[PDB]
């Protein structure tokens, strides 16, 4: 039965997202995306919705299983914010070159009710660590001023 598995997946996944939101340096955005800043980069602009980004990353289920990783391919993968899941679209448009964040994405901002491919079941929250290596022809989105105001409103809740 997938319905019994989904009821379980819904409860423990909620607990997982509740745990990381309680971690000390974790930031919680109104959408539900929770992240932790690992490294602070020297970039000045964030990528726009259609900018190409050079990214090193690793994705984990909340039980520890890694389902994908760009380091075993060795070189960085190219993505656009308008090509990825919602949690990745929101995070990328707030990160500058050199930043390293750990993302905790609830299922409704990831692959949702259907799931993602083979190794990501329905109602699954996702854990990513993400490094933004560079942005093609420079970021054309948020400046450092726009980003800090979004974090300032977040920590104000
Ligand atoms: O799915 C995507 N866009 C379409 C879409 C669907 C639904 C909602 N919104 C958008 C993109 C682009 C992509 C498409 C097809 C691929 F084969 C690979 C990438 N992906 C991602 O957003 C995340 C983000 C981090 C990099 C890539 N992954 S990922 O690691 O989870 C992929 C993965 C999933 C399960 C695995 F077992 C292994 C790998």
Residue numbers in the entry: 7 to 163
Question: What do the authors report?
Answer:
Macrophage infectivity potentiator (MIP) proteins are key microbial virulence factors that facilitate host cell infection, intracellular pathogen replication, and dissemination. They are found in a variety of pathogens of both bacterial and eukaryotic origin, including Burkholderia pseudomallei, the causative agent of melioidosis, Legionella pneumophila, leading to Legionnaires’ disease, and the protozoan parasites Trypanosoma cruzi and Leishmania subspecies. All MIP proteins share a peptidyl-prolyl-cis–trans-isomerase (PPIase) domain resembling the FK506 binding protein domains of human FKBPs. All MIP and FKBP proteins share a general domain topology in their core PPIase domain with an amphipathic five-stranded β-sheet wrapping around a short α-helix, thereby forming a hydrophobic active site32. Inhibition of secreted MIP proteins diminishes macrophage invasion and leads to the reduction of overall pathogen load and virulence, as shown for L. pneumophila and B. pseudomallei, respectively.
Here, we determined the crystal structures of B. pseudomallei MIP (BpMIP), which contains only the core PPIase domain and T. cruzi MIP (TcMIP), which features the PPIase domain and a free-standing α-helix (“stalk”), in complex with fluorinated pipecolic acid inhibitors. In all cases, we found that the inhibitor molecules bound within the expected FKBP-like domain cleft that forms the MIP active site. NJS224 carries a fluorinated thioaryl group (henceforth denoted X1) and an isopropyl group (X2A) and gives rise to a single resonance at −113.19 ppm. The spectrum of NJS227, which carries the same X1 moiety in addition to a para-fluorobenzyl group (X2B), features two 19F resonances. In agreement with very similar KD values for either ligand, the distinguishing moieties, i.e., the iso-propyl group in NJS224 and the para-fluorobenzyl moiety in NJS227, do not make substantial protein contacts and furthermore face in opposite directions. Comparing the crystal structures of TcMIP and BpMIP with NJS227, the inhibitor adopts a highly similar binding stance and the respective protein side chains align well (RMSD = 0.58 Å). The fluorobenzyl group attached to the sulfoxyl group, i.e., the group present in either inhibitor, is nestled into a hydrophobic pocket formed by F43 in β-strand 3a and V97/I98 in the loop between β4 and β5 in BpMIP and the corresponding residues F73 and M125/I126 in TcMIP. In the crystal structures, the inhibitor’s piperidine ring rests within a hydrophobic cage formed by conserved aromatic residues (Y33/Y63, F53/F85, and W66/W94 in BpMIP and TcMIP, respectively). Interestingly, for BpMIP, the NJS224 X1 line width is broader, while for TcMIP, NJS227 displays broader lines and thus presumably reduced flexibility. Finally, it needs to be noted that for both TcMIP and BpMIP, the X2B19F resonance showed a much more pronounced CSP than the X1 moiety.
